[PDB]
Amino acid sequence: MASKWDQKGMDIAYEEAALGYKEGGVPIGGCLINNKDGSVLGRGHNMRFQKGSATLHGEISTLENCGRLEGKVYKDTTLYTTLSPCDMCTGAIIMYGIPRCVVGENVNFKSKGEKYLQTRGHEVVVVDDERCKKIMKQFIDERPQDWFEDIG
Amino acid sequence: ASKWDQKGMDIAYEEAALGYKEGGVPIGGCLINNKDGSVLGRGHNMRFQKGSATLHGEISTLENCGRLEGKVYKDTTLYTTLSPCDMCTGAIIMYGIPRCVVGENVNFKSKGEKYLQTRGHEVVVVDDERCKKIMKQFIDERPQDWFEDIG
Ligand SMILES: [Mn+2]
Ligand SMILES: [Mn+2]
């Protein structure tokens, strides 16, 4: 079953989102898991406020923390993200050839990238995770200026 | 529209050449305000300098710009010595940068170049001989590094 590790992947992604939230950042987390054995290649969260970073989205920080892997490794992984990916994080999934992307929720944010991934041959799974929806809803409500000056 | 294109590509090439001297992939970029030609940021590929999986030349350029107001990006041109991969294409789209000027797409090209135009962005390929030469040399001298990356 392709979804064997999906509860583990989204649980780690949410923990990263909650950790980033406690650090004062945007609560978006992710992790990359080897589909073969469920091992975690890397995990991360949005670093826009922790590091003043314009590019360290949750998915980008996750892939950066994985390090430079062999191209064959990416081809049998799933990228977990608590929030539907923007066009840049979509492009990163495509560029590395990660075949599966499991999305916590796309209620608080959605780009054309979710559909573009499927156009480019990737599998996209939206789990509608209530924990992810709640923590991002709170961020948008409490920090609307930070959100709408960013990808909001 | 193309008033600053020689300035932008010259800075992008200098970043690529600087990255070459540091031992990295010779891909450079810069972001320029279309209004007055001021440089918002510049950078080069940091895959080998920092062991980075994501700091492509275009990504490093945007990182070096810092967190800007969304209105600022909407009137810029991103200059890159090499045609962008799907990730750097997505960064241009996500920030709404309306213009991308590409040094060359002979040594590398992805579906992103056409996708940028599909999404309403202007793409200009200048066929810069300096950029073609320095990337041709890198591919020849470091084929393992190139083909284990986006090659
Ligand atoms: Mn993103
Ligand atoms: Mn790239």
Side-chain angles (χ1 to χ4, degrees), chain A residues 1-14 16-21 23-35 37-69 71 73-74 76-114 116-136 138-152, chain B residues 1-13 15-20 22-34 36-68 70 72-73 75-110 112-135 137-151:
Chain A
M1 188 62 181
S3 59
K4 175 176 190 173
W5 305 109
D6 287 0
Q7 188 181 311
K8 175 183 182 175
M10 194 55 57
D11 195 62
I12 294 173
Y14 176 70
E16 286 296 313
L19 176 59
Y21 187 92
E23 300 174 343
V26 190
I28 302 167
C31 80
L32 189 72
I33 282 185
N34 187 341
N35 291 334
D37 54 9
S39 52
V40 183
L41 300 176
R43 65 179 78 194
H45 49 271
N46 185 292
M47 302 297 279
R48 172 180 187 82
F49 292 93
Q50 292 89 327
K51 290 187 179 181
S53 174
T55 67
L56 282 173
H57 292 196
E59 303 86 324
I60 302 304
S61 182
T62 293
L63 292 171
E64 187 80 354
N65 289 344
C66 292
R68 294 166 298 162
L69 308 179
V73 175
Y74 294 108
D76 199 19
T77 59
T78 298
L79 180 72
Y80 298 87
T81 175
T82 57
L83 192 60
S84 192
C86 76
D87 290 291
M88 176 180 65
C89 300
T90 292
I93 297 164
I94 294 170
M95 182 267 294
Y96 277 118
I98 295 160
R100 261 181 110 246
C101 177
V102 175
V103 171
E105 56 106 348
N106 57 9
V107 174
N108 290 302
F109 173 82
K110 187 174 185 180
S111 79
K112 292 185 174 59
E114 196 184 291
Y116 187 55
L117 283 169
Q118 297 176 313
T119 297
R120 297 289 303 270
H122 301 256
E123 183 185 5
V124 176
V125 180
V126 182
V127 304
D128 204 20
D129 188 297
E130 289 301 319
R131 305 169 300 173
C132 301
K133 275 151 71 177
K134 180 175 180 46
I135 197 166
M136 268 302 307
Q138 285 167 187
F139 181 85
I140 294 173
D141 179 50
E142 295 170 24
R143 297 170 66 173
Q145 183 179 4
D146 291 333
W147 175 244
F148 289 113
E149 289 178 356
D150 185 15
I151 61 175
Chain B
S2 59
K3 174 177 182 182
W4 304 108
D5 286 0
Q6 188 181 311
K7 175 183 182 176
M9 195 55 57
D10 193 61
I11 295 174
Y13 176 71
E15 287 296 312
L18 177 58
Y20 180 81
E22 301 173 343
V25 191
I27 303 167
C30 81
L31 188 71
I32 283 185
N33 187 340
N34 292 335
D36 54 9
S38 52
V39 182
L40 300 176
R42 64 176 77 194
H44 50 271
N45 185 292
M46 302 297 280
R47 172 181 187 81
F48 293 94
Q49 291 89 328
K50 290 191 183 303
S52 174
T54 67
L55 282 173
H56 291 196
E58 303 87 325
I59 303 304
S60 182
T61 295
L62 292 171
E63 187 81 354
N64 291 344
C65 293
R67 293 162 43 240
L68 308 178
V72 175
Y73 295 109
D75 199 19
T76 60
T77 297
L78 180 72
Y79 297 86
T80 175
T81 57
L82 192 60
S83 192
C85 76
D86 291 291
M87 177 181 65
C88 300
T89 292
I92 298 163
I93 294 170
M94 182 266 293
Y95 278 118
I97 295 160
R99 259 182 110 247
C100 177
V101 174
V102 171
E104 54 105 348
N105 57 10
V106 174
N107 291 302
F108 173 83
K109 187 172 69 175
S110 79
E113 196 184 290
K114 167 71 177 187
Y115 187 55
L116 282 170
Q117 297 176 313
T118 297
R119 297 288 303 269
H121 300 255
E122 181 186 4
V123 175
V124 181
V125 181
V126 303
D127 203 20
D128 189 297
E129 289 302 320
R130 305 168 299 172
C131 300
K132 276 151 71 177
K133 179 175 180 178
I134 196 167
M135 268 301 307
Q137 285 168 6
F138 180 85
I139 294 172
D140 179 44
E141 294 170 23
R142 296 170 65 172
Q144 182 181 4
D145 289 333
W146 176 243
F147 290 112
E148 289 177 356
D149 186 15
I150 61 175

